[PDB]
């Protein structure tokens, strides 16, 4: 199940610490392998920094971009949160 045609990159901003729940790291731990295998041509930039509220960006064609926070979401709720971003 690859992405929808139009997503040009994914960008997750999380933190190493448990200050925010480990769910984004738990989802990325599992998702990033399969979510990169099904469509290798798209960059899924995993970027982290201390005290970063979890968050994901999808950049679409002609420079447009969608952001959604991942704060308080669970590893499943975060999954549909990304899912609506790359399904159309």
């Amino acid at each position: 199940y690859a992405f929808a045609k139009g997503v040009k990159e994914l960008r997750f901003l999380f933190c190493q610490t448990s200050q925010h729940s480990a769910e984004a790291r738990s989802f990325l731990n599992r998702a990033y392998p399969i979510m990169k295998k099904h469509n290798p041509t798209i960059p899924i930039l995993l970027r982290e920094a201390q005290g970063t509220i979890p968050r994901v960006y999808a950049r679409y064609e002609f420079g447009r971009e969608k952001m959604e926070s991942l704060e308080g979401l669970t590893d499943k709720q975060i999954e549909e949160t990304v899912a609506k971003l790359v399904k159309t």
């Binding site: 990033y32 392998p33 990169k36």
Partner: protein, 499 residues
């Protein structure tokens, strides 16, 4: 100069990938000398000679005015009549997806790449190349996890290193003050070094295991692999020359497979045995924000509008003959002399630009002087042309762009520090899963630095480096070799320095 008449600016060296901390001494318009300043995590009170003695190339072949190529000649242009001439060409060419191409050089800062990524993205291009050979195609290591392309054990990690393997890099000509740290650890401890690639005259002792991937495969399967296995704090260092090679696809999977096989040694609670060494200041920061060709589909689309963002060591095959070339930079060199329009930008001693060094340390320069002539700041040039091309970029100030920067990667807002890679083990995907079937050619590793004194536009324009190269060619130990002073064969001296 005298020291009391010198202004002191604490900046960062951009002449290699280490980000050595420097003190820039200026007397008004002119930089006078470059001094080291203390950073035990980075440079340890030392800078190399090119970092030190190439500052005299900041005043010699500079770009101060926009030039438009007319009838095979470069004529001066007003900034308005240069951006209009650029906009007209882009409108005429009507570049579709990925026929706009951008190549970024060694000295570009992150405020430019993040600004250029936003300009090309809204023009429909994801074709964002790099100046090295193989910089216009997808890279063997990706950019999804930062640990793919960093010096993951810190520069400070060499202080503990027990076994170090070198893969295709001359640590003297790539990171000269990092090469010294290896020697320091070697003299005072039982550190064992072996290398794969071209032999080099070294300040430390090492074992030459070979020159190509077959040799490296025996290297890990043999005694040095067991030495790498048995050691605490083992350290494999991949040079950026490997990433330039035909078999970077195959080299990078071979190394990481050894690492993943050997965690709890390589991937512990506090250690990262995997390192990639960068020799240019712009390249880790380019990786930090995705300024890299994503797919061979993008790389196979021939461009008709090429922006050379400080690019001067570009391969001649990465620039079409019939493309409209725009060169942005601060020196008149190989990049400027083939372009249709040149735009004068800032140098690193006159900008406040972010740079990320080979280990992922985020550092900022401080402007020592103002802009020469009619030069502009580079991210303002990119923002200015986004007006003319029809897609203005939201930010109008450096803070607004540094807010943009911090939501591409939030580490870019944490200065002077290195962020830890949380999901370290996710490096397997782009390093091994994505690099499995590679048409290995067996071509040996190359020596990517032919001349240490000439590596970029500033060095190639320095009179002092010109004397360093010429004396090194003939061995003249004389102090006034191509400098003012009386000699036995020069009774009357000379005013010329560098000739």
């Amino acid at each position: 100069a005298r020291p009391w008449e010198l202004k002191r600016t604490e900046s960062i060296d951009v002449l290699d990938g280490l980000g050595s901390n420097i003190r820039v001494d200026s007397r008004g318009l002119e930089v006078m000398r470059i001094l080291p300043r203390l950073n035990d995590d980075v440079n340890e009170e030392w800078i190399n000679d090119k970092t030190r003695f190439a500052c005299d190339g900041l005043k010699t072949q500079r770009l101060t005015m926009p030039l438009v190529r007319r009838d095979g000649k470069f004529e001066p242009a007003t900034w308005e009549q240069a951006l209009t001439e650029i906009a007209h060409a882009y409108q005429t060419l009507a570049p579709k997806e990925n026929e706009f191409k951008v190549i970024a050089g060694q000295l570009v800062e992150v405020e430019s790449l993040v600004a250029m990524k936003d300009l090309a993205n809204r023009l429909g291009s994801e074709n964002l190349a790099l100046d090295f050979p193989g910089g216009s195609q997808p890279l063997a290591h990706g950019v999804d996890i930062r640990s793919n392309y960093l010096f993951n054990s810190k520069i400070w990690g060499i202080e503990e290193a027990d076994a170090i393997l070198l893969v295709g890099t001359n640590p003297r000509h790539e990171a000269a003050v990092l090469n010294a740290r290896i020697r320091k650890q070697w003299l005072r401890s039982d550190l064992e070094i072996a290398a794969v690639g071209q032999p080099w005259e070294s300040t430390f002792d090492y074992e030459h295991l070979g020159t190509d991937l077959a040799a490296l495969k025996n290297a890990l399967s043999g005694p040095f692999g067991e030495k790498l296995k048995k050691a605490k704090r083992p350290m494999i260092i991949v040079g950026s020359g490997v990433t330039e090679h035909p078999d970077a696809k195959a080299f990078y999977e071979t190394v990481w497979s050894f690492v993943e096989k050997n965690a709890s040694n390589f991937l512990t609670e506090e250690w990262c045995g995997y390192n990639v060494l960068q020799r240019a200041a712009s390249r880790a920061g380019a990786f930090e924000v995705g300024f890299v060709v994503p797919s061979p589909e993008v790389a196979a689309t021939k461009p008709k509008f090429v922006w050379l963002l400080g690019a001067d060591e570009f391969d001649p095959a990465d620039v079409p003959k019939d493309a409209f070339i725009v060169y942005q930079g601060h020196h008149g060199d190989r990049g400027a002399e083939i372009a249709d329009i040149v735009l004068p930008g800032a140098a690193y001693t006159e900008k406040a630009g972010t740079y990320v060094n080979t280990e992922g340390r985020v550092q900022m320069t401080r402007a020592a002087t103002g802009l020469p002539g009619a030069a502009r700041t580079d991210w303002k040039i990119i923002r200015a042309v986004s007006e003319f091309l029809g897609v203005p970029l939201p930010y109008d100030d450096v803070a607004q762009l540094r807010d943009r920067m911090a939501e591409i990667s939030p580490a870019l807002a944490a200065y002077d520090v290195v962020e830890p890679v949380a999901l370290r083990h996710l490096s397997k995907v782009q390093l091994v899963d994505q690099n499995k079937g590679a048409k290995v050619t067996g071509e040996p590793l190359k020596k990517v630095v032919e001349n240490f004194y000439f590596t970029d536009v500033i060095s190639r324009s320095s009179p002092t480096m010109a004397r360093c190269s010429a004396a090194k060619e003939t061995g003249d130990p004389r102090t006034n070799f191509m400098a003012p002073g009386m000699e036995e064969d020069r009774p009357m001296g000379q005013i010329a320095y560098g000739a």
